[PDB]
Amino acid sequence: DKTVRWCAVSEHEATKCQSFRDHMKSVIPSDGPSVACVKKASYLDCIRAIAANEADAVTLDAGLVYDAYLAPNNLKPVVAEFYGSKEDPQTFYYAVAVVKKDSGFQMNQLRGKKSCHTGLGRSAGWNIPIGLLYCDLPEPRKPLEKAVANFFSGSCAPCADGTDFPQLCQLCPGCGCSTLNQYFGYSGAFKCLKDGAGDVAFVKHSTIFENLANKADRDQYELLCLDNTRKPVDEYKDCHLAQVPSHTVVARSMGGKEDLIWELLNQAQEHFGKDKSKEFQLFSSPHGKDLLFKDSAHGFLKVPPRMDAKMYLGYEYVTAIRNLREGTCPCKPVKWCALSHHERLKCDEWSVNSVGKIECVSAETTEDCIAKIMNGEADAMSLDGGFVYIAGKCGLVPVLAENYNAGYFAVAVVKKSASDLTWDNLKGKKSCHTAVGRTAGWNIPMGLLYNKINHCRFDEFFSEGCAPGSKKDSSLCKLCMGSGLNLCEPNNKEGYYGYTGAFRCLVEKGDVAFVKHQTVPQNTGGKNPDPWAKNLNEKDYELLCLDGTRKPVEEYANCHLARAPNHAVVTRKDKEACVHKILRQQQHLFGSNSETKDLLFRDDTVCLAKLHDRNTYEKYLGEEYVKAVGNLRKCSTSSLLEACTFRRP
Ligand SMILES: [Fe+3]
Numbered sequence: 318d319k320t321v322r323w324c325a326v327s328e329h330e331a332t333k334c335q336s337f338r339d340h341m342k343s344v345i346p347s348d349g350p351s352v353a354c355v356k357k358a359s360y361l362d363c364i365r366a367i368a369a370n371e372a373d374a375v376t377l378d379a380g381l382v383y384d385a386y387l388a389p390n391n392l393k394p395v396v397a398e399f400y401g402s403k404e405d406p407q408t409f410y411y412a413v414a415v416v417k418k419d420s421g422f423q424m425n426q427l428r429g430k431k432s433c434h435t436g437l438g439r440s441a442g443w444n445i446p447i448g449l450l451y452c453d454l455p456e457p458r459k460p461l462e463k464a465v466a467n468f469f470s471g472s473c474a475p476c477a478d479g480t481d482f483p484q485l486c487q488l489c490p491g492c493g494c495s496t497l498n499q500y501f502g503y504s505g506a507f508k509c510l511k512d513g514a515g516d517v518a519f520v521k522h523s524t525i526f527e528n529l530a531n532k533a534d535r536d537q538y539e540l541l542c543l544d545n546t547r548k549p550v551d552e553y554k555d556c557h558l559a560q561v562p563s564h565t566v567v568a569r570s571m572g573g574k575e576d577l578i579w580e581l582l583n584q585a586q587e588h589f590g591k592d593k594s595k596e597f598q599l600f601s602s603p604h605g606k607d608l609l610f611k612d613s614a615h616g617f618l619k620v621p622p623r624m625d626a627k628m629y630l631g632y633e634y635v636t637a638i639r640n641l642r643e644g645t646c647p648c649k650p651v652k653w654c655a656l657s658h659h660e661r662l663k664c665d666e667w668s669v670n671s672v673g674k675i676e677c678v679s680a681e682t683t684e685d686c687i688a689k690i691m692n693g694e695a696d697a698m699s700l701d702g703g704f705v706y707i708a709g710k711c712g713l714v715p716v717l718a719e720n721y722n723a724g725y726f727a728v729a730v731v732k733k734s735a736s737d738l739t740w741d742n743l744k745g746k747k748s749c750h751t752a753v754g755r756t757a758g759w760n761i762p763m764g765l766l767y768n769k770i771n772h773c774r775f776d777e778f779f780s781e782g783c784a785p786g787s788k789k790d791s792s793l794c795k796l797c798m799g800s801g802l803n804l805c806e807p808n809n810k811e812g813y814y815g816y817t818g819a820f821r822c823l824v825e826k827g828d829v830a831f832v833k834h835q836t837v838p839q840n841t842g843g844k845n846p847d848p849w850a851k852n853l854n855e856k857d858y859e860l861l862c863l864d865g866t867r868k869p870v871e872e873y874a875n876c877h878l879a880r881a882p883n884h885a886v887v888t889r890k891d892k893e894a895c896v897h898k899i900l901r902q903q904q905h906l907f908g909s910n911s912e913t914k915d916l917l918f919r920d921d922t923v924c925l926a927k928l929h930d931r932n933t934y935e936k937y938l939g940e941e942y943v944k945a946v947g948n949l950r951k952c953s954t955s956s957l958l959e960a961c962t963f964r965r966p
Pocket residue numbers: 701702755756757884
């Protein structure tokens with residue numbers, strides 16, 4: 318078939334679709350995607366048609382992306398319209414709350430202030446802020462305008478019912494729903510703030526830049542952050558009410574046909590997109606505005622495949638829209654994310670011994686669990702520093718640090734009889750890594766090595782190795798020992814995965830093992846009874862030091878590659894306080910005074926430590942760690958990181 322059935326919501330849109338269908342047939346070969354045109358009465362009918370497999374694709378505003386995600390529709394974002402420019406594609410805008418500098422209040426102190434809105438029923442100006450504030454509104458919250466009129470002391474809410482709720486028009490009497498009103502729209506709401514009518518303007522990240530050319534003027538303004546702090550107006554990416562995708566093509570989550578849709582649209586923009594100047598133009602139409610796509614669009618970007626609608630819309634936006642749609646209002650239990658049947662059994666027991674203060678969700682991989690913390694299905698997990706990096710890039714923050722005694726030591730272990738090996742040159746040698754992306758076995762050693770050879774294709778530096786998480790055909794999977802689909806997997810059914818697995822990898826096959834300072838002592842001298850380790854002696858192994866010589870294993874203090882940031886618990890900023898407080902209550906009750914090895918927490922850890930200043934991944938991991946990880950991800954995978962980076966480069 319190879320047919321993409323596009324859904325139109327108007328007769329004009331169907332006519333353009335039909336033109337679209339006919340022109341693509343001149344540019345796409347026989348074996349290529351074709352266009353079919355389905356005509357429905359509304360966006361929701363298109364959503365339902367696609368879910369019913371009567372059509373396949375439609376482009377929607379953010380609100381309808383949410384509707385399309387809810388059961389029984391279950392559509393997913395697949396292609397994004399971008400704007401502005403090809404070198405700097407603009408896919409999202411940011412809803413922000415702008416205030417005057419030194420006005421002395423935060424997001425959680427908006428009650429009784431004067432508010433400026435773009436217009437009632439608009440996203441940045443109304444639905445997003447009121448959605449976020451919904452449970453702060455006084456009861457009864459229906460009708461919504463009466464509740465807002467009793468929340469702010471006075472407002473300019475263009476198009477509000479000022480006859481029944483005059484407070485909403487105090488700053489623009491009559492609540493004029495047109496440009497005839499000086500405070501209507503994006504520039505109008507900001508002017509409401511600039512002129513001193515209101516205390517806060519609910520606008521987009523760009524509004525202040527388009528109305529105030531001089532930076533000195535903009536320096537008299539600030540942004541309200543959802544964490545109840547303020548930031549300058551050029552830091553909206555760390556200080557907004559919501560991140561909003563402008564226009565998104567959706568498709569069924571299963572059954573697609575996403576690859577066809579992208580193939581179709583990518584070819585359409587190459588032949589009929591911006592500045593192509595054919596008789597057919599994808600981003601205009603002689604009759605009507607914004608048919609099928611926005612006329613201001615400059616092209617399409619493929620949405621990363623790990624992305625679902627909740628992750629695409631973002632936590633803040635989904636919170637606001639859900640409050641509007643559902644209208645439900647209440648620390649509460651901390652929902653821990655477990656990774657295996659063995660990890661879930663542990664926290665299940667933790668939950669019942671915590672008497673409800675702990676609850677348990679399970680996902681099949683670390684990244685899935687991270688996605689659940691981002692969208693609110695989960696709340697906290699403990700992660701290696703490399704995953705704290707991914708969690709941080711995805712908007713999460715470190716809340717507590719696992720303390721085992723300043724971090725643990727990353728060391729390079731070699732067999733003592735191999736006296737030739739030095740850190741100075743290990744090219745062509747066989748390497749053993751915890752897994753790609755982890756602190757001790759990858760980010761620290763391969764970050765340092767990156768500085769020496771100025772590239773990160775390490776399978777061409779080492780002859781072969783085991784680095785679980787590498788591509789199955791890579792030479793860094795050749796030494797691994799998992800069988801079938803398990804070979805080179807970053808989990809337990811790969812016997813060379815982890816701190817201990819990488820040491821075993823060295824004992825049996827490798828030349829160098831990148832692990833931590835306790836690994837060799839803990840799996841030598843009979844402490845590990847498994848046949849591969851049982852008769853090993855730790856004086857038969859040395860550590861490579863940075864200067865180029867070697868020392869014994871217990872001399873790691875003066876022969877390590879770098880100090881490693883300890884594993885940390887991560888959560889969202891809105892649960893940071895509660896997770897901080899509930900876990901210290903839990904370790905006071907069940908602390909150091911797992912059934913297998915290292916479930917939920919490292920068994921080395923004695924306590925969960927306070928972070929104080931270092932409550933962001935950049936400040937927790939440190940400057941050089943982040944730089945090295947930034948260097949290594951040019952060669953790295955991680956579909957989650959790709960999805961998070963798509964929303965924040
Ligand atoms: Fe680690």
